[PDB]
Amino acid sequence: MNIFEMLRIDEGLRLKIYKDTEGYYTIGIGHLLTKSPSLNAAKSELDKAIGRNCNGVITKDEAEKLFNQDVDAAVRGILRNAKLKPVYDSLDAVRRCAAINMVFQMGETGVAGFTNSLRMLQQKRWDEAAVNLAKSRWYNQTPNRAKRVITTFRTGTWDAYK
Ligand SMILES: CC(=O)OCc1ccccc1
Numbered sequence: 001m002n003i004f005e006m007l008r009i010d011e012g013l014r015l016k017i018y019k020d021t022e023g024y025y026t027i028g029i030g031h032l033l034t035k036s037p038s039l040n041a042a043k044s045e046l047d048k049a050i051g052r053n054c055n056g057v058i059t060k061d062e063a064e065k066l067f068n069q070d071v072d073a074a075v076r077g078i079l080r081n082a083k084l085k086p087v088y089d090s091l092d093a094v095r096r097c098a099a100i101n102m103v104f105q106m107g108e109t110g111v112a113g114f115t116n117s118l119r120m121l122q123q124k125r126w127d128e129a130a131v132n133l134a135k136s137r138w139y140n141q142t143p144n145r146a147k148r149v150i151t152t153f154r155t156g157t158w159d160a161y162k
């Protein structure tokens, strides 16, 4: 397993504009287009991202290229963030994937409230970090996704995805 297979399982694949769990227009493998309620704004964001007039539909190749850019962007966001990079560098390869997964879903700002979890992860207090991560809006709104990611942090294995 690797980060691309993990996120493909968590996000699925849809080739037409859809709404995510929060109601935001999204396409492909979890690519957020806009938080605006306007479908026309979302369609404009899509055409800009793809470079052609899509009318709300993309190919599988396009979805996979967007996904590669989005994973790249998540990793770059971790590496440029002075709070996240030291924690990321302390983790093994499997747990790094759980870290990217959370940034992909919530962004650098969505993880800003997780200061206490980050310290426990850096100290390798896995069970304690798992409990702290579950005390969140994230866990309460998307519990199955959160359980898979938390289990990955707790165990350092892919067992939640097998
Ligand atoms: C708050 C959290 O558990 O996010 C995981 C993480 C760890 C290091 C860098 C980015 C995200």
Ligand SMILES: [Cl-]
Pocket: 141, 142, 143, 144, 145, 146
């Ligand atoms: Cl869920």
